[PDB]
Structure formats: structure tokens, C-alpha cells
Design a protein around this nucleic acid. Structure first.
Ligand SMILES: OC[C@H]1O[C@@](CO)(O[C@H]2O[C@H](CO)[C@@H](O)[C@H](O)[C@H]2O)[C@@H](O)[C@@H]1O
Ligand SMILES: [Mg+2]
Length: 580
DNA sequence: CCTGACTCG
DNA sequence: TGCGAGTCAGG
């Protein structure tokens, strides 16, 4: 059938009730400076559709949007909030966000539209956005009749679904997780995205020129060593050259043809001088295509800023992700790529970039949750955790720990956090499974509490059907009971890792909320720009650095109280590169 | 659109 | 098979 609603030509009093489901539709996937195609409001008085030009030009409606005492229930309120920010309109009073509610209830559902969330509660009186707008080249806003009913149906679904979603959240002990963590964070992410990060495009272009030169040199050096020209960026063409023309050993047979992955070539390097060059070529090639050309493509022509979008409802562990561009994967590990960060600068003159990061948050969280005496003491002494681990598993004094020993102990710690497995560790350290198993046994002997936790968390996952984080985020693991070893093992590793990675995510999210409250209380001009999993990047007047050096670490370190202290390091400088 | 390469915590 | 993510050239 059809859903009744008023297609209003002007805003009316009854459309401004103090409780309503609100839809401010932005169809463009990237909502920055994007158009709002329509508005829908559902409240105690009825269902309404408003043309944006009319609603957003009405002083009464705008005041309503900005009145924190007028409560709104929405789906992906950040999208609407940011689209409105670009129009100079403030959105306040969002008391419920269906996207975040659904995400917390079950991140694996992949809910990305009202229909998907409603289907969770057997409500299907609303169409999927894709069905209405289509996808790809066929994407398009339907005629008003169609658009209007869709927005109203979405608003009606939100209106109806709020109660049941909140009820289940409460049963899961996630009510505060939504109301006191994710929703307030949503508003903070909106400010960060809207603020954007300034890019020194002239610096990027010059780096681009220099890379084009080096890339040319390496490219020619590769054709020279191969005795012919070919597409180096073609794993297929590359494979023929390496394993056929040059007769290099085939140590890995992937899906189709051969494998020319990083660790495969790293092992082939000793056989021919071409391998090193191919690796370097790929390194520089990625910098050019993605961090030079790709980045320049998304920099706003006028402001020279990039405005990422933090997807707050995607990862299975509670982390955020970043896109167009992804500002959470800018090079830093290799010096040549790290230079890219010199192109990220403060948005105002005489300002600086300030970066604060948690030191070993994952292992500190593990110590807390597993309550391992040895691991908690290590952090209480603020020891170099990898050196300490080597001392324990290899039974040597601190002075006897060699560089190679620390390296392997470090790999063991990663394995432990990721969900330790003979095969996995062996593959990473390039050693036998038995040897890797020996390392693992030694680790558990030194950290019996961690062994206990890994055993218990897997059992708990099987009993309850899910695992939880410090702030009650959850992840269902049905595969934990699979009689297929490989499938079950994936689930077991997830049971071990999710509480760690997820809890670390919970912590920094609270740190961000606490920090913004502090910045506001102090009326500092400093503001957050980015979050990179265990670090927070801000920009501020140079005159605020001394205050930031004390405030940021303290806030981050005190976000939550664990059985071991939380440690935060920080640096600042003229560019992101210099904030080291 | 899919694969395999690279980037990050 | 070690955990969690995104982007791009070639197929
Ligand atoms: O507004 C972000 C919000 O929208 C979703 C859809 O529910 O993702 C859309 O927007 C992202 C940023 O432009 C795209 O990467 C994604 O492809 C598009 O569907 C959510 O995942 C997200 O929380
Ligand atoms: Mg760190």
C-alpha cells in the first residue's frame, strides 16, 4: 500500500514538536559540501515532507534544528550534521542514531541504510536506498513523488524502531555505549571532518616531480636487468619475467599464475639484483599513484584542505575507518614515504601540528584483562615490553638480549595480540611451525595469566556466543562452534583479539570526548584533526603548545582506569612530518 | 567489478 | 591463518 504524509509547501508549527524522527537526505556518498535533496519529519502530529530550499530558508525550522531541547531521532546523523555545517546550519538535539544503534547491536550485519536496520526487527515497510537511488552510473535522485515517500518511510521506520532498539541495547548493557560514547563522538567526528586538514600542494607537486625522476631511473634499471621492457605493475607480466625469463625459484603458488608478493620477493632478493629494484619501484610507485596524484585529486581546489569521512559504523572491533582520502594510512615506516607528511600543515599561520599516541595500548589492555602478574608488573615498571618478553622466553638477562632476540620476541607479542597460532607466527618469522610452537610455549610459561585468558575467552565465546570489550561493545562469533578447523580457528583468534583491539578503541574514543570537553572548558583554539587508532592529531596556535603538552596526555591517560597505567607520548612541529 | 599489490595501527 | 582497515593499476 502507500504511507500517508503531507507534502508541505511551507513549515508549520506542528512540524516543530520537541520529539521527532528527522531525515535530512544527502544522496552523494561523500556528503562534504553536498546537496540535501529532501527533508522528512515524523512526530506525534503526523508525517511531513519538506523541500530543502523551503525548510532550510525558514528561520523557524533552522532554529528548531539548532535547539538542543528539541529531540531528533535519525539514521547517520553525522552525514546530516556535516552537510548542514557546510551550509552554516547547526544541528543539535540528536538523541538517537539508528545507524549507531544497529552497529552496536551487531557490527557484522553491515547495516548501511534504514531498511537494513529495520529488517533486524522484522520491519520491512521501507525500501533499501540502493533500490530507490540505484548504484554507480545509474545513481540518481528520483522524482519528488518517489523521493518523498521514501524519506517519509525512512522517518517512520526510525520513529517506530527507536524504542525496540533502545530496549535491546539496554538488555545488552550497551545503552550508555550508544548515548554516552558513540553519539557524542559522532558530533566530534563531524567537527573534525568539517575542519579538514590543510595540504601544501606545492610541496606535494615538487615531491611528485622528484619521485617521477627516481621512478624513471629504477624503471629503466629494471628493464636493463630483465633484458626487456614490461609492465612492472602487472603481477602477471612480472611473474613471467621472474620465474620464466630469469628462472627465479618458485616458492609460492597463489590463486592464478605465480605470486610476487612482498615476502615472496624478499626471499628471492638474494638470487637476482632485479628483485630489490622491483620492490623499490613498487614502493615509490605507490607513493606517486596514491599519496601524490591520488591525494591531489581530493584536495579542495579553493581551501587546499582534504576532508576525510570517518566511518563510525563499519569495523568489527569498534575502530573507525577513514576514506576519500584515508588519512589513517599515510606513509611513515620508510623515510622516503614519510616525507609525504611534510605536505600536511596547520590550517592557519603561526599554528602547529600536535600528535599524542598511546604507548603499547594493546599489550597494556591485555595485561589488564588477563590480569597476568608478570605482564602487569612489566608495565608498572614501564619496561621496554619487547626486551622484557625476550628476557623471559629466551631466559636471558637484559644485557644478554640481542637485537635479533628482541625482534623475534616482538613478533611473538604481535602473535599473542592477534590470536597466537603456530602457522601464523612461523610465517611471519619465517621459521618452522615446531619452532614457532616452542616460542609460544615459552611465552605462556612466562605469562600464565595470558594463557589462562586465551583459554577462557574462547570458552566464553562458545558459551555466550559473543565476546565483549571494556565498554560493552560486542562481537558475535558463531563460527566458534564450527567443526571445520580453519573456520573455527579464525573465530578463536577473533575471540582473543577483539576484546583487546576493541577495548583499545573504546578507550581512545572516550579520550576524544573527554579532551573536547576540556578544550572547550579552557576555551583553547586547539582542535582535533584526526584519530589514527591509538593516536590523536590536533592543530593549534604555537602559543598553546605548552598547555597541550600537559593537557592532552593527561586526558588520554586518564580516560579509563586499568590495573596498569596508560602511557602517552607526544610531539609537535611545523608539519605532520615534524610532529615526531 | 576482481585481484594483487601497496599503505597504516 | 597470525588482528583490524583503504586505494589503485592491471586484468
Ligand atoms: O555517511 C557515512 C556512513 O554512510 C555509510 C552508509 O551507511 O557509508 C557511505 O559513505 C562512505 C563515505 O563516503 C562510503 O565509504 C561508503 O561506501 C557509503 O556507502 C556508512 O558505512 C557510514 O557510516
Ligand atoms: Mg604508539
Amino acid at each position: 500500500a502507500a504511507m500517508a504524509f503531507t507534502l508541505a509547501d511551507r513549515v508549520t508549527e506542528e512540524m516543530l514538536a520537541d520529539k521527532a524522527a528527522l531525515v535530512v537526505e544527502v544522496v552523494e556518498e561523500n556528503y562534504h559540501d553536498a546537496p540535501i535533496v529532501g527533508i522528512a519529519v515524523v512526530n506525534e502530529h503526523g508525517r511531513f515532507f519538506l523541500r530543502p530550499e523551503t525548510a532550510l530558508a525558514d528561520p523557524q525550522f533552522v532554529a528548531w534544528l539548532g535547539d538542543e531541547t528539541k529531540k531528533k531521532s535519525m539514521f547517520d546523523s553525522k552525514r546530516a550534521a556535516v552537510a548542514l555545517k557546510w551550509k552554516g546550519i547547526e544541528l543539535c538535539g540528536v538523541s538517537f542514531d539508528l545507524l549507531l544503534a544497529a552497529y552496536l547491536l551487531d557490527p557484522a550485519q553491515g547495516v548501511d541504510d534504514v531498511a537494513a536496520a529495520a529488517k533486524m526487527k522484522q520491519y520491512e515497510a521501507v525500501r533499501p536506498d540502493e533500490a530507490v537511488y540505484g548504484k554507480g552510473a545509474k545513481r540518481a535522485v528520483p522524482d519528488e513523488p518517489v523521493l518523498a515517500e521514501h524519506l517519509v518511510r525512512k522517518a517512520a521506520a526510525i520513529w517506530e524502531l527507536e524504542r525496540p532498539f533502545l530496549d535491546e541495547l539496554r538488555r545488552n548493557e550497551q545503552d550508555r555505549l550508544l548515548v554516552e560514547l558513540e553519539q557524542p563522538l559522532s558530533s566530534i567526528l563531524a567537527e573534525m571532518e568539517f575542519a579538514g586538514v590543510k595540504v601544501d600542494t606545492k610541496r606535494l607537486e615538487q615531491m611528485g616531480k622528484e619521485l617521477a625522476e627516481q621512478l624513471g631511473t629504477v624503471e629503466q634499471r629494471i628493464y636493463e636487468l630483465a633484458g626487456q621492457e614490461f609492465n612492472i605493475n602487472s603481477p602477471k607480466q612480472l611473474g613471467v619475467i621472474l620465474f620464466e625469463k630469469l628462472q627465479l625459484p618458485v616458492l609460492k603458488k597463489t590463486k592464478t599464475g605465480y605470486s610476487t608478493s612482498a615476502d615472496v620477493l624478499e626471499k628471492l632478493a638474494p638470487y637476482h639484483e632485479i628483485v630489490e629494484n622491483i620492490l623499490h619501484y613498487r614502493q615509490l610507485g605507490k607513493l606517486q599513484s596514491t599519496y601524490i596524484e591520488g591525494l591531489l585529486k581530493v584536495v579542495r581546489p579553493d581551501t587546499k584542505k582534504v576532508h576525510t569521512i570517518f566511518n563510525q559504523a563499519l569495523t568489527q572491533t569498534g575502530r573507525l575507518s577513514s576514506t576519500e582520502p584515508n588519512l589513517q594510512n599515510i606513509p611513515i615506516r620508510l623515510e622516503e614515504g614519510r616525507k609525504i607528511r611534510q605536505a600536511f600543515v596547520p590550517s592557519e599561520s603561526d599554528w602547529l601540528i600536535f600528535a599524542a599516541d598511546y604507548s603499547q595500548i594493546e599489550l597494556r589492555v591485555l595485561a589488564h584483562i588477563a590480569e597476568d602478574d608478570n605482564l602487569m608488573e612489566a608495565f608498572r615498571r614501564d619496561l621496554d615490553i619487547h626486551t622484557k618478553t625476550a628476557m623471559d622466553i629466551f631466559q636471558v638477562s637484559e644485557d644478554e638480549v640481542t637485537p635479533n632476540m628482541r625482534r623475534q620476541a616482538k613478533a611473538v607479542n604481535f602473535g599473542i595480540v592477534y590470536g597466537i597460532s603456530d602457522y601464523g607466527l612461523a610465517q611471519n618469522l619465517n621459521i618452522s611451525r615446531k619452532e614457532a610452537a616452542e616460542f609460544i610455549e615459552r611465552y605462556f610459561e612466562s605469562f600464565p595469566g595470558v594463557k589462562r585468558y586465551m583459554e577462557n575467552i574462547v570458552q566464553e565465546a562458545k558459551q555466550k556466543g559473543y565476546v565483549t570489550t571494556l565498554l560493552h561493545r560486542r562481537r558475535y562469533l558463531p563460527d566458534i562452534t564450527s567443526r571445520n578447523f580453519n573456520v573455527r580457528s579464525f573465530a578463536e583468534r577473533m575471540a582473543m583479539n577483539t576484546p583487546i583491539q576493541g577495548s583499545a578503541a573504546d578507550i581512545i574514543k572516550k579520550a576524544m570526548i573527554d579532551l573536547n570537553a576540556r578544550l572547550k572548558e579552557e576555551r583553547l583554539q586547539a582542535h582535533l584533526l584526526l584519530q589514527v587508532h591509538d593516536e590523536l592529531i590536533l592543530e593549534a596556535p604555537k602559543e598553546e603548545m605548552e598547555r597541550l603538552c600537559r593537557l592532552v596526555p593527561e586526558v588520554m591517560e586518564q580516560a579509563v582506569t586499568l590495573r596498569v597505567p596508560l602511557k602517552v607520548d607526544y610531539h609537535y612541529g611545523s608539519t605532520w612530518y615534524d610532529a615526531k
